[PDB]
Amino acid sequence: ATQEEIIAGLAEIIEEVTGIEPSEVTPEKSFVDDLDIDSLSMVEIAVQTEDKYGVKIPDEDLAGLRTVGDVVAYIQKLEEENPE
Amino acid sequence: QLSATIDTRYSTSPTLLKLLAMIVGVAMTVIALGALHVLDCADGRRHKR
Amino acid sequence: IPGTALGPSRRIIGITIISFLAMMFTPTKWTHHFGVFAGLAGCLGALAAV
Amino acid sequence: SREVIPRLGAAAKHSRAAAWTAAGLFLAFWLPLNNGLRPEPIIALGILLTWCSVERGVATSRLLPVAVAIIIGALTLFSGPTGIAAVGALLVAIGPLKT
Ligand SMILES: *P(=O)(O)OCC(C)(C)[C@H](O)C(=O)NCCC(=O)NCCS
């Protein structure tokens, strides 16, 4: 529910899939610009997050989600139908 | 009269039934993997390369 | 290995070990049968350089 | 150089010594051992394409590249009697197929 605890999990997923150390993932940093993450790793991060969070994002953020701050803001403003 | 049957056991050729079974089996394998792709594209994501 | 992905590194090392173990069931023991490792050698070169 | 090394991570993708020693071990295996008509280059390229198809099936979570990897592995299993080395790439691909 907090931004500063979903960043700590998304940095773990990015570290597992790609290999960036989790001290580099800051919410002002872009994906294909500074982290330099290719598209197969984008699909792999998407299916890992679908496995762990349970939210399904097929195509609405495949071409509209740029930075990790936008990811965590999307997670914050979508969570109103909590299954917990 | 000398006679000798030569061992030509590897000089075979397919019959009609074996040839039709090979053709229909390869065609059914192709159709099965095409249906497997149509099942895999259920989640909305396209090819793009 | 620190700056690398987990799964692919594990699977490269596992495939190379199982290839060495599976190569003992061949009927002839020649030296030119090591040529099957020419694709895995670049992968282990990248891992052993990192 | 285009499929495996950018897949193994970021420290393997942005470093140059990894590329030069990967090229070196590739040539050191290819030149004395694969300049002929034997099934050895077929089996080497088949093991790479089997691992690449399986690795693409895990990421996108799809079964068709796993089935293509089964076809390629069974195809290079019967190139020669030394093709039994492809059972490594076949047996590592059981856990991912279960997932
Ligand atoms: P990235 O832009 O390099 O693309 C990698 C991925 C895997 C996301 C690519 O878009 C893709 O989905 N390829 C799948 C292709 C496919 O399934 N083809 C079927 C027969 S051509």
Closest CA to D5 of C12, C34, A73, C16: C12
> How far apart (Å, rounded) are the C-alpha atoms in residues B14 and B18?
6
Closest CA to A76 of A18, A27, A24: A27
Tokens representing residue A46 in the block? 């998407």
> How far apart (Å, rounded) are the C-alpha atoms in residues D8 and C48?
12
> How far apart (Å, rounded) are the C-alpha atoms in residues D71 and A19?
31
Domains of chain A by residue range: 1-84
- List the determination method: cryo-EM
Is any Cβ of chain A less than 8 angstroms from the Cβ of B3?
no
Question: Which residues, 6 or more positions from D86, have their beta carbon under 8 angstroms from its beta carbon?
Answer: D43, D46, D47, D50, D73, D76, D77
Which region holds residue B7: left if phi is over 0, alpha if psi is between -120 and 50, else beta? Answer: beta
Please report which helix (H) or strand (E) contains residue C41, including its range. helix C40-49
Look up residue A15 and give its DSSP letter: H
Distance of CA B16 to the CA centre of its chain: 14
- Nearest atom in ligand 1 to D65's CA: 17
User: What is the least distance, in Å, from the CA of B30 to any CA of chain A?
Assistant: 26
- With tokens 């190379």, the residue in question is C16
Which region holds residue A65: left if phi is over 0, alpha if psi is between -120 and 50, else beta? Answer: beta
CB-based burial label for D99 (10 Å; 0-12, 13-18, 19+) = exposed
Closest CA to C23 of D80, D93, D82, D76: D82
> How far apart (Å, rounded) are the C-alpha atoms in residues A46 and A69?
15
Q: Which pairs with CB-CB distance under 8 Å and at least 24 residues apart come from C30-34?
A: C32/D33, C32/D38, C32/D40, C33/D40, C33/D82, C34/D29, C34/D33
How distant, in Å, are the alpha carbons of D93, D94, D99 from that of B36?
A: 18, 19, 17
Chain D contact set for C29 (CB, 8 A):
none
Are the beta carbons of A37 and A44 closer than 8 angstroms? no
Chain A contact set for D10 (CB, 8 A):
18-20, 36
Is any Cβ of chain A less than 8 angstroms from the Cβ of C46?
no
Can you give the three-state secondary structure of chain D, one letter per residue? Answer: CCCCCCCCECCCCCCCHHHHHHHHHHHHHHHHHCCCCCCHHHHHHHHHHHHHHHHHHHHHCCCHHHHHHHHHHHHHHCCCHHHHHHHHHHHCCCHHHHC
Choice from A17, A18, A31, A39 to test ligand 1 binding pocket (greatest atom count within 8 A of CB): A39
Taking the centre of ligand 1 as the mean of its atom positions, its distance from the CA of residue A17, in whole angstroms, is 18
> How far apart (Å, rounded) are the C-alpha atoms in residues A6 and A13?
11
- With tokens 């997923």, the residue in question is A13
Nearest CB neighbour to C33, from listed D24, D54, D82: D82
The count of CB pairs under 8 A between chains A and B is: 9
Looking at the DSSP assignment, which residues form a beta bridge with residue A30?
A67
Look up residue C29 and give its DSSP letter: -
Are the beta carbons of A58 and B44 closer than 8 angstroms? yes
Is any Cβ of chain A less than 8 angstroms from the Cβ of B45?
yes
Hey, of C6, C9, C10, C50, which one would you mutate to test binding to chain A, going by the most A CBs within 10 A of its CB? C6
3-state helix, strand, coil split of chain A in percent (to 5) is 55, 0, 45
C40-49 vs D17-33: helix crossing angle, rounded to 10: 150
Closest CA to A72 of A11, A22, A16: A11
Looking at the DSSP assignment, which residues form a beta bridge with residue D9?
C4
Phi, psi of B40 (to 5 degrees): -70, -25
Q: Give contacts of D 55-84 with B, CB under 8 A.
A: 60, 62-64, 67
Are the beta carbons of C15 and D91 closer than 8 angstroms? no
Q: How many other C-beta atoms can be found within 10 angstroms of the C-beta atom of residue C14? A: 14
Please report which helix (H) or strand (E) contains residue A51, including its range. helix A39-52
**3-state secondary structure (DSSP) of residue C6:** helix
Question: Which residues, 6 or more positions from D66, have their beta carbon under 8 angstroms from its beta carbon?
Answer: D53, D54, D57, D93, D96, D97
Hey, of A15, A42, A44, which one would you mutate to test binding to chain D, going by the most D CBs within 10 A of its CB? A44
Closest CA to D73 of C31, A40, C19: C19
